[PDB]
RNA sequence: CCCCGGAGGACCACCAGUGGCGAAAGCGGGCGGCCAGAACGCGCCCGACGGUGAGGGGCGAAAGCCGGGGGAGCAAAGGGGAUUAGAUACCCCUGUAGUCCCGGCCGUAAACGAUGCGGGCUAGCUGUCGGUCGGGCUUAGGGCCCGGCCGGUGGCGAAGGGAAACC
RNA sequence: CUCCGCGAGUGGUCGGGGUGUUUACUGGGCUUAAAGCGCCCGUAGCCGGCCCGGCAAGUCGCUCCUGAAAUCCCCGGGCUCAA
């Protein structure tokens, strides 16, 4: 049986996909098919009281995205197994 | 490519009448959708046939009164001998009581009943009931 | 034209305030009015006072006990209770319980005529047993609202508490004075602030 | 493309149910066919030459006016057509292609769309013959046509 | 334009315009939907512009028709 | 018998007296009982007889799923389907959905090899389907007999139709099915307009 | 039409804006015109759902 | 590992989307030149010139073949280090065709929407792309918002259909 | 042992038809069960807008010459009924 109409991979009026490599990985997916979390990151973790405001300590916070297939995915916890009435709602996966 | 104006316009009225309207236009439409239209309507099948009059060849809207149960036109248009109309008459109607089929012979389409009085055959067109 | 509620006390309500969705149901049928800028839908208050009459008129033609006026909305609980308490309909805020009408087992199983109910999108069971055990219904649409089963619509806010005590205020005045209760020029003892639900 | 395209346009002009001349019209229709005569001998096509009526002179439609066509009108005043405007257009079309073609034979997008031209050019030689507006021995030779360009 | 099966009788949604040209004072009858450049026919100054639209107007606009 | 609901009332009470008046305005039996006081002579029949297992750990555990018709063999037919643990329950509880499904059906003739005006048959061409099994059926001339299958004669003769042709299609020997696509047909009648 | 055809059984309140019969077991709604009260209404099942509008024949209001 | 320079081949991150274009395959940096095909607006031209299409033809991923050029990264085959009962696999180091360009051949794929092409009719709600019209604002912009039409692209869902998933 | 079906018959293997809407004109199906060519240009073929006038080819109605006899259907009669 076809699980989703989607074909699981928002594709779109296309024929092909230009397609990306998996970061831990390189099974990979085309550019739809492949989860893209963003995460804050910054260096030196909550220093900030003995840093930054003591010395002058110019700290900086880059937004990093990461890409990963569905084995990925699911290995790092960012893809569940969600149930059938659960595939259909829209959840932003934590960032 | 549109070909065939009446089963387009007979299609139109099982579409309409399905969803319980009151009247539906039909465009495009020559001589053949009006001569049956005026059967129909002197059957009780389908109110008043007003005409509009646009560049594009004319309009028709039919005001429905429910008293379809099921129409369409026969494909392709078969030639009948008036011996013959008996047994095209239960193809496509039920009961012997019930429902006309749309006849186009050479003295004008009319009812299959009235092709049986003239004791005439023809060209089949249509079946309401 | 004259109005059942003077014109400054409809538009101090809001009653002729829709949700900014589409209906193309009501717009043909020309229950709305205009549209602003903004993109909201503004009714017409001239068929919104027409249709509240009508309904009085229906509702006084069955027995006060067999029309059921349910809202699961909370903002209606209050003005649904002081609509009936004047006119003695089985007032139902909460939970319509599935099975009321289409089980006769039920501990409530409810024998009802008529069915009012507030916004058929949110109180859709209510309306669902209706469709089912063939009870006719009223309702104060809006643009938001599916009209399936819905044999009296009035188009109106019912979304707002003033909204919503402003209408049922005059519903319940009106239905009186067709009943009889009520002179053609009388008014009910409490005024529609206290219909308003707090 | 003919066949098995994504989009699938309405775009056209609604004309009047039964058009009648205009009221403000200020042209008779002695005036009217001479004008077109005038652009004719100035060079533009019948389709381009019905564009400059409406715009700068505001005659709406040579017929309802005239009684007459564009074409019809232009061809009573010695203004004969080497071939049907629309052929002529679509023969054109495919020299500016295959002259395209020479220094870039490796366009297969632009070899296809040339394969629908000069498909569109077969179609209406054919509907041309039957009617008989062009000669019944004419033959689309692409390098025996050079000229039309 | 719309479904002809569906409005009744289709009529031009486009309108004729008379124009008087700023410089000159000529009164011209134009295209509202011009598709080319509009002249005055006595000056020559531009009287319209044509866009993917209605067209734009250079010159006062007189009455339309 | 308590007369609820409140058509059981009127049913009790002797205010409606006649199945036709339960048909003719459109009210919905909700009670086997009403029924039962206004068509005495109902006839029953057990059309099909079916073991369901559902399996779990410690095995299936078993039921029967009894399909039921009743009718009066005047027009009036009604099929229900029963599943219990017992054979006894499930008869009756496919009895109790039979009468309340019961349906009037609209009789008489039609055939072009018939002239009476007698009820022995159907009027006009109908047709019911259930799941895949697709029955038409067709007026007949009298004296034909019923030309459908065993399981299909039960229910056209419980609904008092006495000649009939008929023309299946799917898998007719799911009985259920068969059965319920011969009961929609009948029920079918009253939407054509007339 | 229908000629000479004997149909027997009862005849379901027929609906008044479509001729759609309130068949055994879809249950339909009858009731007054509601400016009036006096012409009777008869919705069937389809027609509620569909939202099917109608009309009083003795005054001019109209409904869903 | 860090800095100053040079050379080389491949790719075009974020923006970026069930976004766009294309008949399918397929196409993602900027500027330019030559072409193609559409959508919208139109009182422009012709006047049925149309649909489908056996046979016939053309285009057609990857791998692969023929001859030339090129060769950074990757990497069939192979070499080695491990693991293992075995390990001619999975991991690691390395590695040659190949991958890239040009001319030709092959003509296949889960070449898929597993859904042939053309046309008409049949509730609606909602996101978004292109054009256009009306109203309101303006980073006064080719800009933004509201509404209508036409044409695409997603989701939910009337009637209806289905063995059902579902359309 | 007893019972069942048919009976001067009753069985076995073949072949045809029904079975069988599993050949689908009436009257099937092709997302997933077998089944849409990877895509497109197009020849024959098939299918094709509207109105007016002419012909009457198809088509429809009547009639005639025919389509051997036998066979087939209906009606009457003769073998005792029957064949
Ligand atoms: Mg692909
Ligand atoms: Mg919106
Ligand atoms: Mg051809
Ligand atoms: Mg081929
Ligand atoms: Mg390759
Ligand atoms: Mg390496
Ligand atoms: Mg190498
Ligand atoms: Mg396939
Ligand atoms: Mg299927
Ligand atoms: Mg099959
Ligand atoms: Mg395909
Ligand atoms: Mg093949
Ligand atoms: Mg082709
Ligand atoms: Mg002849
Ligand atoms: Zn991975
Ligand atoms: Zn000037
Ligand atoms: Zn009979
Ligand atoms: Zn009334």
């Given at each position: 049986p076809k699980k989703r109409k989607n074909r699981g991979?928002?594709?779109?009026?296309?024929?092909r996909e230009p397609y990306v490599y998996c970061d831990n990985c390189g099974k990979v997916v085309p550019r739809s098919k492949a989860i893209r979390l963003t995460v804050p990151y910054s260096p030196v973790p909550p220093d900030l009281a003995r840093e930054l405001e003591k010395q002058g300590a110019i700290i900086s916070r880059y937004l990093v995205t990461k890409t990963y297939c569905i084995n990925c995915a699911v290995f790092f916890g960012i893809i569940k197994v969600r149930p059938r009435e659960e595939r259909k709602k829209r959840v932003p996966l934590q960032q | 490519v549109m070909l065939d104006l009446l089963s387009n316009a007979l299609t139109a009225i099982k579409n309409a009448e399905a969803m319980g309207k009151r009247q539906v236009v039909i465009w495009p439409v020559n001589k053949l959708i009006y001569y049956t239209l005026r059967v129909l309507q002197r059957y009780g099948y389908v109110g008043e046939i007003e005409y509009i009059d646009d560049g594009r060849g004319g309009k028709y809207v039919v005001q429905l009164?429910?008293?379809?149960?099921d129409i369409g036109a026969i494909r392709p248009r078969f030639p009948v001998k008036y011996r013959e109309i008996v047994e095209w008459e239960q193809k496509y109607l039920p009961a012997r009581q019930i429902g006309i089929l749309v006849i186009s012979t050479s003295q004008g389409v009319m009812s299959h009943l009235e092709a049986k009085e003239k004791k005439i055959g023809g060209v089949l067109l249509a079946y309401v009931y | 034209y004259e109005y059942l509620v003077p014109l400054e006390k409809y538009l101090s309500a809001g009653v002729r305030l829709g949700t900014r969705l589409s209906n193309k149901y009501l717009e043909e049928r020309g229950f709305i009015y205009a549209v602003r800028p903004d993109g909201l839908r503004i009714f017409d208050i001239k068929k919104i006072d027409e249709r509240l009459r009508i309904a009085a008129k229906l509702i006084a033609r069955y027995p006060p006990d067999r029309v059921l006026v349910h809202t699961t909305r909370p903002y209606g609980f209050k003005p649904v209770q002081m609509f009936c308490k004047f006119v003695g309909c089985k007032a139902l805020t909460g939970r319509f319980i599935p099975g009321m009408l289409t089980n006769p087992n039920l501990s409530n199983y409810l024998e009802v005529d008529l069915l009012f109910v507030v916004d058929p999108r949110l109180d859709s069971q209510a309306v669902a047993e209706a469709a089912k055990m063939g009870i006719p219904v009223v309702a104060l649409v809006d643009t938001d609202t599916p009209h399936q089963y819905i044999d009296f619509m009035i188009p109106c806010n019912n979304k707002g508490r003033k909204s919503l005590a402003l209408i049922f205020w005059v519903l319940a005045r009106q239905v009186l004075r067709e009943r009889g209760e009520?002179?053609?020029?009388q008014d009910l003892p409490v005024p529609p602030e206290e219909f308003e639900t707090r | 493309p003919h066949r098995s395209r994504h989009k699938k346009g309405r775009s056209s002009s609604v004309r009047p149910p039964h058009p009648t001349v205009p009221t403000w019209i200020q042209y008779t229709p002695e005036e009217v066919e001479q004008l077109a005569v005038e652009l004719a001998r100035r060079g533009f096509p019948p389709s381009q030459i019905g564009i400059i009526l409406r715009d700068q002179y505001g005659i709406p439609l040579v017929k309802p006016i005239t009684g007459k066509k564009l074409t019809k009108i232009l061809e009573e005043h010695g203004i004969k057509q080497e071939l049907p405007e629309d052929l002529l257009n679509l023969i054109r079309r495919a020299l500016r292609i295959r002259k395209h073609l020479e220094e870039h034979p490796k366009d297969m997008a632009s070899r296809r769309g040339l394969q629908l031209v000069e498909s569109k050019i077969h179609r209406l030689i054919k509907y041309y013959k039957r009617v008989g507006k062009i000669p019944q021995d004419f033959v689309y030779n692409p390098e025996a046509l050079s000229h039309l360009a | 334009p719309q479904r002809f099966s569906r409005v009744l009788i289709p009529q031009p949604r486009s309108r004729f315009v008379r124009l008087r040209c700023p410089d000159c004072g000529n009164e011209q009858v134009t295209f509202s939907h011009a598709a080319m450049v509009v002249r005055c026919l006595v000056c020559g100054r531009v009287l319209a512009q044509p866009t993917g639209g209605k067209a734009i107007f250079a010159g006062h606009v007189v009455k339309v028709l | 018998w308590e007369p609820k609901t409140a058509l059981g009332r009127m049913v009790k009470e002797g205010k409606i007296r006649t199945i036709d008046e339960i048909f003719a305005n459109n009210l919905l039996i909700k009670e086997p009982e009403i029924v039962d006081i206004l068509l005495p002579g109902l006839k029953q029949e057990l059309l099909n007889l079916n073991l369901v297992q559902r399996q779990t750990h410690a095995g299936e555990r078993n039921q029967f799923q009894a399909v039921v018709a009743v009718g009066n063999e005047d027009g009036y037919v009604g099929v229900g389907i029963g599943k219990s643990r017992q054979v006894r329950q499930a008869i009756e509880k496919a009895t109790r959905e039979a009468k309340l499904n019961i349906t009037p059906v609209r009789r008489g003739c039609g055939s072009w090899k018939c002239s009476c005006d007698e009820p022995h048959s159907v009027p006009f061409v109908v047709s019911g389907k259930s799941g895949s099994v697709e029955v038409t059926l067709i007026p007949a001339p009298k004296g034909v007999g019923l030309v459908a299958g065993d399981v299909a004669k039960v229910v056209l003769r419980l609904a008092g139709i006495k000649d009939v042709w008929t023309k299946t299609r799917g898998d007719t020997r799911t009985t259920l099915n068969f059965a319920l696509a011969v009961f929609n047909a009948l029920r079918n009648t009253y939407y054509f307009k007339l | 039409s229908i000629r000479g055809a004997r149909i027997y059984g009862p005849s379901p309140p027929a609906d008044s804006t479509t001729n759609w019969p309130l068949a055994p077991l879809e249950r339909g709604v009858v009731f007054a015109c509601p400016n009036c009260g006096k012409t009777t209404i008869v919705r069937s099942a389809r027609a509620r759902k569909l939202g099917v509008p109608y009309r009083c024949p003795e005054c001019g209001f109209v409904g869903p």
């Open positions: 991979r928002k594709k779109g009026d296309k024929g | 009164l429910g008293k379809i149960n | 009520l002179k053609p020029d | - | - | - | -």
